[PDB]
Amino acid sequence: VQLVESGGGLVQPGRALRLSCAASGFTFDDYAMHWVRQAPGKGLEWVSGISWNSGSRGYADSVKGRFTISRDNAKKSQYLQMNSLRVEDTAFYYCARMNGTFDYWGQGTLVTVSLASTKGPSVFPLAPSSGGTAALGCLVKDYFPEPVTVSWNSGALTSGVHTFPAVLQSSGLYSLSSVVTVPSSSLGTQTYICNVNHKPSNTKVDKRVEP
């Protein structure tokens, strides 16, 4: 009953980028699929929409001609082709279904249109300090742009996990921390691994955290 987007990332001004949206938990041609974005500092803005049978297609006057929407029914995926990208197109892009109202939304995906260079993070383990409960973590330092994903033990660990919102430093680079709070006795029985993924810089790292 959820929606999932993909294709987001950093691109230079004038270039192209394709966004996808996989559907699940409901049928195919029962709803029109739309794309709604939110640029930093501004409110929500409708971008594009395509009918249930691809009969009618809509485009905001801001993306007239440059954007191309299309629908698939086999894999239940809708697509948004973004050409002639400008800096103003920088936003979180959501996909949403509609039969009168946008009743269900996807998690959203970030698209950055910029001349800025990508930078991959360094990943450092934050070791448990020498009872009852212990905190350990991973520092994810100096990267651009958002986002990075952090998980623990390949997703097998979510209990007690707190990934903190990034700080944007005066340098223009991001840095965040993820910490798990675990029982002290688990330090000797459990392996703790932080999985950090920064897609724009092709940086995928699994760092072991040990006392």
Partner: protein
């Protein structure tokens, strides 16, 4: 020309009744609007659809406390017995049809604040620079602050009981999924500074009370 205007912020006491206003144009006093709820780290959720005649169908997973009303050009979102987990940005939307062209305008969004929640002092975790980072000729201290309300803290860094402000970066407090707040603070150092002192401290001030963690080179 189609305009949705709503207030930017609104504060309400805990357990009280709350009313949010969305105002359409005068040429569009007939239209049906929708309410959306935008919570951090989450997809915007559909709250309800509100027609001019007063009829309203709530969304899947929306409490009984949520109501809607139509008055002239105004559209209201009513919340009786407002709970902490109702802290969000409420955005109104409206649709129309000109030509074959599709039109959909979102309002600016209203940030709703729920006051009168129980006080909670922050939990503080302080991490030393890692061994690998020190190898890379870098040193950063990480002060993690969580589970506090209200969402306003002050962080002070000390090196051997003497304040440091030189290389400090601190986040804005942000809502956790348990309705309490979190924040983090980073102190950047050279390996030399880190070694030349006996200890560093992160001191967190919150509503007059203080929590401090200390960390030392080994």
């Amino acid at each position: 020309q189609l305009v949705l205007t709503q207030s930017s912020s609104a504060s309400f006491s805990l357990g009280a009744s709350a009313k949010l206003t969305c105002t359409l144009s005068s040429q569009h006093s007939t239209y049906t609007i929708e309410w959306y709820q935008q919570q951090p780290l989450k997809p915007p959720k559909f709250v309800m659809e509100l027609r001019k005649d007063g009829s309203h169908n709530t969304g899947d997973g929306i409490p009984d406390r949520f109501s809607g009303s139509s008055s002239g050009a105004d559209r209201y979102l009513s919340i009786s017995n407002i709970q902490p987990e109702d802290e969000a940005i409420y955005i109104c939307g409206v649709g129309d049809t000109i030509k074959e062209q599709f039109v959909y305008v979102f309002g600016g969004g209203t940030k709703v604040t729920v006051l009168g929640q129980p006080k909670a002092a922050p939990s503080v975790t302080l991490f030393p620079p890692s061994s690998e980072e020190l190898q890379a000729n870098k040193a950063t201290l990480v002060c993690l602050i969580s589970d506090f309300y209200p969402g306003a803290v002050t962080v002070a860094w000390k090196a051997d009981s003497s304040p440091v402000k030189a290389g400090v970066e601190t986040t804005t407090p942000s809502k956790q999924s348990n309705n309490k707040y979190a924040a983090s603070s980073y102190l950047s150092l050279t390996p030399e500074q880190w070694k030349s002192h006996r200890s560093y401290s992160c001191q967190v001030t919150h509503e007059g009370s203080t929590v401090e963690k200390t960390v030392a080179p080994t």
